Amino acid sequence: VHMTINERAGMSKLVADNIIASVIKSNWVVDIHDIEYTAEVMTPSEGYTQHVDAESIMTAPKGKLFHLQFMDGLLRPEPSAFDPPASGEDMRLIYPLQP
Amino acid sequence: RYHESVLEIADIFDQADFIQTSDAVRQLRALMPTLSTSQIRHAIERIAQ
Amino acid sequence: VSGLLMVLFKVMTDNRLVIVGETTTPMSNTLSTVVNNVLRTTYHNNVGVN
Amino acid sequence: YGAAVVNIDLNRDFFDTATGIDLTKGIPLVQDLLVPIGVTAGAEQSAEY
Amino acid sequence: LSDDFKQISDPKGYLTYSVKYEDQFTKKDKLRASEADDRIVGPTVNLFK
């Protein structure tokens, strides 16, 4: 389904998990609104400096704006022809809709 | 066939020396929470000091 | 019956004026929607049970 | 040669802490202006913008 | 002249609520639901656990 949370206040626990689990194990498209954030782009090299959790994104106070950094990666040299391969990799869990 | 929402900027006068402020001040106003009497008094004091 | 004559007496001689002591003016944003669309501006400090 | 992103914003200098203005984030954040009165302030508020 | 009234601050009340839960179901650990709400709501949620 395509979920749309407006009141992320009285949602409480247990239910806050069934939402954050059905997105992973059933391909649910969820949504939030009261969450306010200040975004700033981040260079490919150096990587991330701060990482938040999917449980805290469901309990954050209504009027407290936290910053969550978004990765760039346009200018990043690709690997050499001879090197070890990979196995079932990265899953990203959040997306801005602004832009 | 329903309405909408716009602004007028008081352009219907064409008399100078009045209406100095424009549209944009209203947009800034309808963004903050509604301030009570004691909050306004506090806000005046803070900017002053 | 004697105990009721004590309740009725206590209410009869009850002189209490109410001076507004303590308050809060909650910032419109934090307490939200269902609890915001119900309180008229400023409440006390000792909101009871309802 | 080899600059990732070159963006524009408010000056870190002209608007300084000598006038309460503070912007580490990219957003002009002031410490106190409009606030809950009876209640204590918050560690972070969207009103601080 | 004629001394009469004696002022309080927070009124009492004649009729009040009283609850009696039993164990095996109760969870006296969690007393939280929000922030500036846990002080506007509960007790009105801690007397109805």
TrEMBL record, chain A:
It comes from Bombyx mori cytoplasmic polyhedrosis virus (BmCPV). The chain holds residues 1137 to 1235 of 1333 of the full protein. This is VP1. The lineage of its organism: Viruses, Riboviria, Orthornavirae, Duplornaviricota, Resentoviricetes.
